[PDB]
Amino acid sequence: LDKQIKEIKEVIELPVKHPELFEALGIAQPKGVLLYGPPGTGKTLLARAVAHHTDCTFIRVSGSELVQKFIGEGARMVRELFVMAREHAPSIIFMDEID
Amino acid sequence: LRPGRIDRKIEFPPPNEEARLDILKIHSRKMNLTRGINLRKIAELMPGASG
Amino acid sequence: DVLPPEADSSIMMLTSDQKPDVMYADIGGMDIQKQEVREAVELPLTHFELYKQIGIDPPRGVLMYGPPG
Amino acid sequence: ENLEEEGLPKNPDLRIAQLRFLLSLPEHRGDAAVRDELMAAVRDNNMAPYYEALCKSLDWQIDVDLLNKMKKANEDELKRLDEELEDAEKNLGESEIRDAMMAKAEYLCRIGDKEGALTAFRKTYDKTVALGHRLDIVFYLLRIGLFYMDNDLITRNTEKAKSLIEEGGDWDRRNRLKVYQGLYCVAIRDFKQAAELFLDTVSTFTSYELMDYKTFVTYTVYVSMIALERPDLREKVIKGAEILEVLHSLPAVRQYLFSLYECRYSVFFQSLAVVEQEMKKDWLFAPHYRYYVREMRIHAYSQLLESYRSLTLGYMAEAFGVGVEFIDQELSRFIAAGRLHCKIDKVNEIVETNRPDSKNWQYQETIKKGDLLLNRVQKLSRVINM
Amino acid sequence: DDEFEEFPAEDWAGLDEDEDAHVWEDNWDDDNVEDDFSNQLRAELEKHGY
């Protein structure tokens, strides 16, 4: 996945480490990434690897009601996790579709 | 799928013969392997397999 | 005070009299299931060092699922 | 066919250290063949700092044109790596910055700049995120340590490597460390540990950057004959399928190994002399070539006398293909040293074997090894007070 | 500290090129002056006419 590592680096690593590159380029920093492929191909492996290498907090949002007490007692809308995401910025919010 | 929502879409195709060898090399490092294992043949023996 | 670890447990282990009378021979036609359970439960208990030498990480838990009966 | 490609990078080349060691010996100082090979490695890799040290210790004539040509390459390549490091730290990502220093550390190690490589590797280790990449840097430092026989470097990095293998269960790296550990154990006369580590990796050997497999099996046999008992030798070495396959291509080593096991003492002594000269020219076994051969002779004498209550001096001499006087001097020297449990009746030329208990041998070491401990305790209290 | 300048410090003249720099259980038997075992055996093979 050498090609995939480079692709995700310019989108998740470069905006975090070097925000000035995008400002000089005049483009908005990327914020959403989609990793698509057959199951077991390494999508979660690469997403976790980037968060580990850029020192970005890795948050996996499975929608589980077991972890809902940690997100917040409200639990009415999924954006309540942003409070924990802002506190641990830079953060990578990862969701995997079982399908 | 609307442009501007997802800034980059990255494809993860099933590993080919060479990529399977790299994955085979990575995970076999966690085992007591006899010298001379031909992991290339084992990679060839797994067509269309995932990591 | 600090009580002994084996103390203060509402759940008890199986005594000699509480051991079920079902043998492996009493079960018929589950060789695949017996092997998987044996390789993951009773073999790691007695052959933990062999697992480490080969490089296998023994499974901490086993989930047995299927239709009832 | 891809055996050598599996090994770790050959930095530093341990052949160069062996070539340097041969020139240190008075016998092979003037060997043009060894000098040409060492110079070929130096010229190819532009090892300018090694050239200065080679000519300083060995008192050689420095080729000004060759040194200047190599030094210019080193400055140009260091400048290129510095530019790459500058480029990566400003625009590229941290993994690319890490690779830039790894090339700089690798180049300094290649050109023989030991002090620069150790600093560069330490900088690379500090901001290397991957655990295996960190462990490779440790293996680089271990190879650097073995190249210069830096005991502090080897021992410190061996402990670090052991810890890294514990965190990430890399059995592949674990097998390599045993070869690295066994090589150091050979260098520090720890044949008991060298034999154990070598035999565990006789079927998992991929450390081709240190040695070739035939050489590894040759050393594995050598340390086994001095550190293993007779039952352990038969199960592991004599009946070892991996060793036996290699011994087909090494008739001398197989002759040396099987002569002692099959009690062909005249054959064994001839093979022992051959092993001596091989060990004298080996940079690892050179400090211990006298010790190993002396110990091997003790093993052969004890093995012959082990099963017999008494043997005549002539029979011992006939078995080893030597004279009676030679057996007399050798046996007397080893009995006085306390290594052979027998006594010589020179009037009748009979050697009578003894059976001293292990309690006596255990008592003396406790007196010996305990005394060594007491001096450290005695001396440590001396440092404490003032 | 009161260093012992009274006692004549014999000049070092030593080899600072890592003469031994080793840590073993070294004993006196390795230092016995004698030719190599190959020479000793080679000096005895012909002593018997072989």
Ligand SMILES: Nc1ncnc2c1ncn2[C@@H]1O[C@H](COP(=O)(O)OP(=O)(O)O)[C@@H](O)[C@H]1O
């Ligand atoms: N390309 C790859 N290289 C090495 N290991 C892989 C690769 N792809 C998958 N794996 C292994 O598969 C396991 C689970 O894969 P995962 O990333 O969860 O699949 P998915 O991408 O479908 O989420 C991981 O522990 C990882 O070690």
Ligand SMILES: [Mg+2]
């Ligand atoms: Mg999946």
